[model samples]
Target: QESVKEFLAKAKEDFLKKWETPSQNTAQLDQFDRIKTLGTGSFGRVMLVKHKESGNHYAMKILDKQKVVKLKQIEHTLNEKRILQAVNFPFLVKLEFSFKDNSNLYMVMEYVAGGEMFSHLRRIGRFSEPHARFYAAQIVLTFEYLHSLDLIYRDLKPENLLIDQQGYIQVTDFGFAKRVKGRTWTLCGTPEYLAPEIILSKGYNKAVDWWALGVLIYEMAAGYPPFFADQPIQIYEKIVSGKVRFPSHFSSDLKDLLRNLLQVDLTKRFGNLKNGVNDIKNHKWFATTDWIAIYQRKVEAPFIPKFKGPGDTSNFDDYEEEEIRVSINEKCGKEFTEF
Candidate 1:
C-alpha cells in the first residue's frame, strides 16, 4: 500500500497539475469567435464564444475599461477577479481565465447551459417546495463555504443564480462580493433583498446574506418577492418596516424558517446567532435534507434544462448583435493590462 505521505504528495501534484495557471497570452480576443450575446449589464456584456483551438464553448464577460473607470468600479472589478481566481467551489461558477486588452477587460468562465434561475422562475410562476428546497440547500452550502473564507455575498438573488445542465445551482456574478470579517457600512444590494442594517446605514456583516436568503426563499416559494412596490423608496420602506406577509398557502415550517432568517435583530438571525449556520441546518423545513448527499451532488436535481448539445444557446434570451469598438486611453490601457 502507498504510504500516507506519498498519497498526500500525489494528491498535491495532481491538484497543481489540474489547476495550472494559464499563460497571459492564452486569452485574447482573436482566440475566440463570438457566437452571440449571452447577457448585458451596466459595464459590459457576456458573450457566448467558442475557442478556435479547443473547439470548446465559454462565456466571456467583456467590460469596457473606460466605463468601468468612469463608474469607479475599478476596485470592485479587481476584487471580483481576485475572488474568482481564489475560489474553486462546485456551486460557484469557475473563472477559467482573465485578461485585458487596450479597451476592455475579459473574464472567461465555464458556460452554464441551463440559463438563469430568474427565467425559469418567471416561466413556472413558482417552484414546488421540493424544488425550492433543493436550490436553497445548495445556496446554503455556498454561503457556508463563502463565509468560511470571510467573504460576504451581498447580492444573492434569482438573477445571480444559474441552473446548470444537470439542474444544479451555480452562483455567479461576484461583483458585489467582498471579504468582510467584521461590520461594513456599505449600503448596497437590491432593495428587496437588502437587510435592514444595510438600508439604515448601520454596520453589517455576513448576517445580511442570511437575510437575503430569506427573501430568496420567499420569492421562490411564492410567485413574487416578499416586499414589492412601484418605487425603490417604497420597497426600502417596506423592508425597513420588517413586516413580511406570506401567502396563505405557505406552511408554518417555512414561515418559521423565514422569520428566523429575516430577523431584523442581527443577534437573533439564524446564521448570525451563536450557533451560526447550525441554527439554519437544524430548521424543521430542512429536516429531510441530506446535507452530505447534497454537498457531494448525490441528490438528484428537480429540474434539468434541455439542450441539443454542448454549444446550445436555446436557454438564453435573444440579444441583438452590436459592434465591438476599442476606446483606448494610454494610461488606462496600461493599468488594465496589468490584469
Candidate 2:
C-alpha cells in the first residue's frame, strides 16, 4: 500500500500537471517586445509591450509569485485572474495570457492607453452632467454583468477605472473582488467608495457595488469625492451617514439620478431587489442612448491617448525590483491553461 506522504505527493503532482499549461499557446507574447515599464507594485510591475508578431499592443502585468505570497496576496491575485476569466464584456479588459514562470506569474492583457479616469477628472476639475451620466451608464452595464456572475467589485473608484485607447471605460483592478453567493465582510477598498453597510462591517453583497457607483457618479459631477475628510475614520463616517452634497451646477436630471443612486437604503436604489440593470437602463437620463453604437464600439469617446505600441514602454516611468529570471525551455505545447 502507498504511504500517506507518497500518495499526497503523487496527488499534488497530478494536480499541478492538470493545472499547469504553456502560456505561449493561449497568448502571443513572443509576438510582442517589452518596450518600457509602466508601473510597479510590491510584488509586480506592468510593462507597455508590443506584439512583434501581430503588431498589437498590450499592458503586460508581471507578478513575482514568491513576493506576492509573502504579501498575503495569493488569494487576491488568483481571484483577480478568475474574475477576468469568468466575465466577458466590452467594458472590461481582455486577459490574453496567464502563466507562471520559475519566479514570476505573467498576465498579458489589453492596454488601456487613456490612463486612469482619476487623472482626467482631476485635470478637468469636474465633468458635465451628461459626461457623468455616460460613465455611470457604462458602469451600470458592468455591474449588471458582474452581479449576474455572483461577483462583487468591492473597489469602484475612478483610479480603478481605465479609459481605453478608444476613450471607452474599461474597469480594471479586480484585487478586491469576491464571490458573493450569500454575503461577505472584509473591509477592503478605498474608504471614499465604501458603502454604509461595509463601513459598519455589516454583512453585504452586490448592493455595495451600487453604493460605490453612487459615490463614483457624485465625484464625477463634483470634481471631488463626496466623503472628503482629513482622516479615514471621518470619511467612513460621512459615507455611512450618506451625507453627499451635489454641486450647484448639477442639473435636475443629474441630481435626480445621483439622488436615486446615492440612496442610503439599498432596497430602494436604482436596481432594488425586484428589478436589476434594466431599471437603470430605462432611466430617463439614458433615454436617447444609441445602444447599438455603444455596444459595437462605434461611438466616439471624448478622450484618446497616443500609444506607439503595446509594449513600447518608452513613455512609461520605470521602477526597480529584485531581478527575476525564469526558464520556459520545458514548457508544454498546449495553448491554454485548463480550468
Candidate 3:
C-alpha cells in the first residue's frame, strides 16, 4: 500500500492523459488552485478553481471515492465521467479534463459564469410568461439533443441548471444520466420530479423527460412544483393522482402547454407523441418563438446575470463547508484505475 503522496507521484508519470492525450502532464490535481466552494452534494463538493499556469478559471467537481463506493454509486460515478467525456453541446457544461487521486476523482469543467437558475427564480418569485418561455425553450432543445444521443438526463431541476454570463444554461450533474436503448429499471431522480411510470415501476423511456419538462414549466411559471407536500410520500400520492391546480393568472395558452406536458398518459404526452418534440415547439405559447434563432443563441436571454468577470461568484450563495470529509480509498482504488 502506497501513501497519498507516493500514489500521486507514480500516477503523475503513468497518468493516462484523457482529453488531449499528449506527451506531457499538462494538467494535474496540484496545478489547480481551489478558489472557493461552489456547491456541495451527497458525494462531495464542486470548487471554483484557477489553473496556476494559464490563470484559467474552472469549476472542479470533486467526488469522495470512499463515499461513492459505500453508497453503491460506483457505476453512476464512472458512467457520469464517461458521459461527460463524450458530450459537447451549447447547453451542456464542457469537461475540459478529468483526473483522480487515491482519495477522489476530479472533473474540471468550464466555469459557467452565472449562478444557479434556482437562486434567480427564488429572488424573482416567479418569471413572467415570456421570460419563463425563454429559459424553457433552451431546456427543450437541450433535452431533444440529449434524446438524440439516446441519453437520459434523469435529474432535471433548477438547481442543476446554471446561468451563464450570456444568460444561457449550462446543464450540470450527470451522476444520474445514463444511455438507454429501450428502458432501464433504475429508481432514481428527485422524489418530486419522479414520473408515474417510475413511481409505479412500470418501466420508462425518454418520455419521462418530457413529463419532467411539464413539471419544470409549471414550477417556472408558478414558483413551485405542481405536486408538493411535507413528505415525499404525499408528493408521490399527488403525482400518481395526476391532479394539477393552476393559478388563475395562468394564460390559456400556457395552461394548455402545461396540461399536455404534465399529462401522465405516455401516449397522450406532447413530446412522446407522433410529432415528437415538434408538438411542444409549435404550441400557441411558442408561436412568437424562432426555434432556429433560439438554438443559434441569437435571441437574448430574459435574465442576464450581471458580473464583473468570468470568475465572479456574486450570483451564487455562500457555502459554509470549507472543510470536506476525506477518506482513503482502499476498497475502491483499483476500481477507479482507469480514471
Candidate 4:
C-alpha cells in the first residue's frame, strides 16, 4: 500500500512539474491576484480572486497534489476537471481556466456571489414546498445532463452546492465524480448522503445519485437529514433501510416523491431503469414547474442571500472557516494552497 501511495505521489509530482501549464500561459493569469480564502476542504482551498486583466472576479480553486495523493484521490480530482470541462450549462458552475504550480493545481472558475446551499438552508431554517420543489427541479435537470454523459456525482450535499447571484443553484465540487461504464463499488462521499449500496460495498451505479437527490430534497424541506446518527454504522443502517419520517411542513405529494427516490430498492428509485428522473419530472409535485423558464434560467428562485464581491471578507459567516496560503512543496517544486 505504501509503495502504491508513493508511486502515485511521485507520478503527480512529475505531472505537476512538466505537463501542467503555469498561470503565465493562460490569458487570465495576468489579471488576478489572490485576495482571500473562500473555503477549504481535505485537499484544497477556494480563493476569492480579482482579475486585473478583465476587471472581472472569479473563485480560484487551488488543490495540493501532495494531499490529493495522500487521500488516494488523484484520479478523482483529474476526473473532476474533465467532467466540468465537458459540461456547459447555466446551472453548473463554469470553469474558466486551469493551471498548476509545482505543488498545487489551480482551477479558475466562475465566482458565485451568493453563499453555499448549506448556509442558505440554515439561515432560512427550512423552505416552503414550492421553494424546495424549484431547487429539486433544477438539480434533477443537472443530474440528467451529467448522467446522460455517464457521469455520477457521488457527493451531493448542500455544502457542495452554491447559489449564484441569479438564484440558480450551481452544483460545485466534482472531486468525487467518476465516469463509469456501468455501476461502481468504490465507497466515498458524506456519510449522510451515501446510498445503502455504497455503504454495503456492493457495486453501485447512477442510482446512487438519485438516492442523494432524495437526501438533498429532504434536507431542503426539513433543515436536517432524516437519518441522523452519531456513528457511521448507524447511519449506514438507516440508509440501507430507507426509513424517512416526514416533518409537519412536508406535503403529501412531496413525501411520496421523497419516498420514491429514497427507496432502498434500487429498481424503484428515481432514474432507475424502470422509473427515473423522466418519471419524477412528470410527478404531480412538479406539475406547475415551468420547464422552459427553468431551462432559460428565468425562474425566480425562492431565496437570495447578500454578499460582497469575491474579495469581500467582512461576512465570513457564509464562507468556510479556513485560510488559503500558497506554499511550495519540494517534491513538486510548486506552491499549493486551499481555497
Candidate 5:
C-alpha cells in the first residue's frame, strides 16, 4: 500500500500541475457545437453548447468586450471571473473553463437543465411553506459558504437562481458579487430586494443579502414581492420606511422570521446578530428542516425539472437566433488579452 505521506505528496503535485496548466487550448469557442440560445442580457447571451470531443453539454456565456468596456464594467467582469475561479460549492454554478478572443470573453459553465427559479415561480404562482423552506435552506447554506470566503453576493433574486435537474438550487450570475471583508458602498441589486442601508448610502456588508432573503421568502409565499410599485422610487420609499404589511393569512412563525430578517437595524438583523447564520438556522420557520440531510442532498427536492437528456433545452425560453461571428479589432486585442 502507498504510504499516507507519499499519497499526499503525489496528490499535491497533481493538483499543482492541474492548476498551472493553461486553459487556452482546453476551451476554444470553435470546439463547442452550439445548441440553442439559453438567455440574453445586457452583457451578452448565454447559449447551450456541447463539446464535440467529450459530448458533454455546457452553458457558454459570451460577453461582448466592447459593451463591457463602454459601460465601465471592466472591474465587475474581472471580479466575477476571479470569484468564480476561487469558489467551489455544490449550490453554486460551476465555471468549467474561461477564455477570450479580441471581441468577446467566453465562460463555459455547468449546464443546469432545470432552468431559472424565476420561470418556475412565475408558472406555479407561489410555493408552499415546505417547498419554500427547502429552497431557502439551500440558499442559507450557499450564503454561509460565500460569507466564509468574504464574498458578498450582492445580487440574490429568483432570476439568478437556477434549478438543477435534481431540483437543487444553483446560484448563478456573479456580476454584482464582490469580496467585502468590512463594507462596500455600491448601490447595486434589484430595487425590490435592496436593503435600507444600500439605498441610504450607508456602507453595508453581507447583511444586505439577508434582507434580500426576507424579500425572497415573502415572494415565495405571497407570489409577489413585498414592496411593489410601478415606479422604483415607490419601492425604495417603502423599503426605507421599514414597514412591511404582511398578509393576515401568513403564519406567525413565518411572519416573525421575515420580520427578523428584514429589520432595518443592521445590528438587530437575524444574520448580522452575534450568532450570525446560526440564528437563521435555529429560526422556528426552519424547525423541521434536516439541515444536514439538505446539505448532503439527501432530502429530495420539491420539484425536479423534466428533461430528456443533457442537451435538452426544453426548460429554457425560446430566444431569437443570432449568427455567431468573432470580429477581432487589432487595436483592442492587446488591451483585453488578460481576460
Candidate 6:
C-alpha cells in the first residue's frame, strides 16, 4: 500500500523473475506456413501461421500498406510496432517477428490460443465474480507496469484480451498505445469505452486506462456497459453525466470499486488519486487475490481453454483463406516507411 514509484521499484524484480526470452528471427516471408484465417479486418486477415523451422504457431497480422496510407492509419500502425517491440509482459501480447514486404506490413505475435474475452462474454451472458476478478486482477498488474513507464494504453476492450491455453489473459493489440509524458488529446478510442475527459476534449493521461478498466470490469460481470446505448452520441452523453445503477446481483465490495473507477472526477479515481495502483490492488474485491501467484501462473484460473493441440483454431470462426487482391496504389506521405 505504498506509492506507485515504490511499487514499480519492487515490481521490476518480481516481474523479471523468469524473463520471457526475446529472440531475433525475422528474415524471410516463407519462414512460416499459413495455416488459416483467424480474423479479418479492413487492412487484411490475421492468419494463423506455423513457423516452418521452429514448429511454433503465431498469429501473423498482414496489414496492406496501401490501405494504411489512404486511410491515414499510419499514426497508430507505426506506433503499434515500436511499443509492441519494447514491451515483454506476460499479460500483454509480445511481437516475435516484424518483417514487411513491398505490399503489406507483417507483425507476427504469439497466438493467444483461447480466442477472446469478447467471445466468452457474448455466449456466457456475464462472468461470475470469481471469473471477472481473475481477469480484472491481471489488468491491474498490466496497467501498473505500463503507467510506470509513462505509456498510455488508450484502448481497453474485450476484443483485445485474448485468453491463452493456460487460461491466463494476454492483452493483444497495442495500436492505440503511445508514450505520453504529459497530457494527450486524441479523439481516437472506441465509442462505448470512451472516458469523459476524452469526450469533453480535455487533455488526459493514463487515467483513461483506469476509467476503461472500470467499464471492462463492469461489463465482464454485468454483461454490458453501464452506459449502453445504440447511438455513439448517446453513449457520450451517458458517460459525461456519470449516472449509473449497478445490477442487483453486484455485491457491496464490487459496487464500491466500481464507484471509485466509473466516476469522472480525476482526483477521486482509484489509480489517479492517492495510493496509486495499490488502492485498486488492495481493494476489497481483490482482497482474495494472490497477485504474485496470478502473474507467475501458480494459481489456477476459474476456466482453462481446453484444446487438442497448441495450434488449435476451433475457438475462432472457421474461414476460407480468401485471396486478397491489393488494388490501392495512391501513396501518401512517407512517415509510415518501417514496420
How would you encode candidate 5's per-residue C-alpha lDDT over 1-339 as one tens digit per residue?
244346435544543353344344247898899989999988799999999989999999998887887888777877677677666667999989898876788888899999999999999999988999999999998887777667799988899999998899999999899877799998888999999999999999999999999999999888899999999999999999979999876889999999999998899999998888989999999999987789889998889998888778888999999987688554256556555
* Native-to-model Cα distance after best TM-score fit, residue 150 in candidate 2, in Å: 1.4
- How many steric clashes between backbone atoms does each model show? 0, 13, 0, 10, 0, 0
Q: Which regions in candidate 1 have their CA more than 4 angstroms from the true location?
A: 1-26, 328-331, 334-338
lDDT of 4 by residue, 242-268 (tens): 577889778888888888889898877
Candidates 1 and 6 compared by TM-score, better number: 1
How close is every model to the real structure, measured as TM-score?
A: 0.91, 0.81, 0.90, 0.85, 0.91, 0.90
Model 3 alpha-carbon miss at residue 181, Å: 0.4
Q: How accurate is candidate 2 locally (lDDT)?
A: 0.71
- lDDT-wise, the better of 3 and 6 is 3
lDDT of 3 at 115: 89
lDDT per residue as tens, model 1, 153-248: 889999999999889999999888887679888777788899989988899999999999999999999979988999988998898886889888
lDDT of 3: 0.83
lDDT of 3 by residue, 86-191 (tens): 6766889988988777678888889987989999999999989898899899888888777766778999999999999889889998989987788888899998
Candidate 5 regions with alpha-carbon error over 4 angstroms: 1-26, 330-337
Candidates 3 and 5, the one with greater lDDT: 5
Candidate 1 weakest lDDT stretch, 10 residues: 14-23
Q: Which ten residues in a row have the lowest lDDT in candidate 2?
A: 330-339
The whole-model lDDT of each prediction reads: 0.85, 0.71, 0.83, 0.77, 0.86, 0.83
lDDT of 2 by residue, 215-281 (tens): 8888988988778899999987777775678778877776777777777877787765576666667
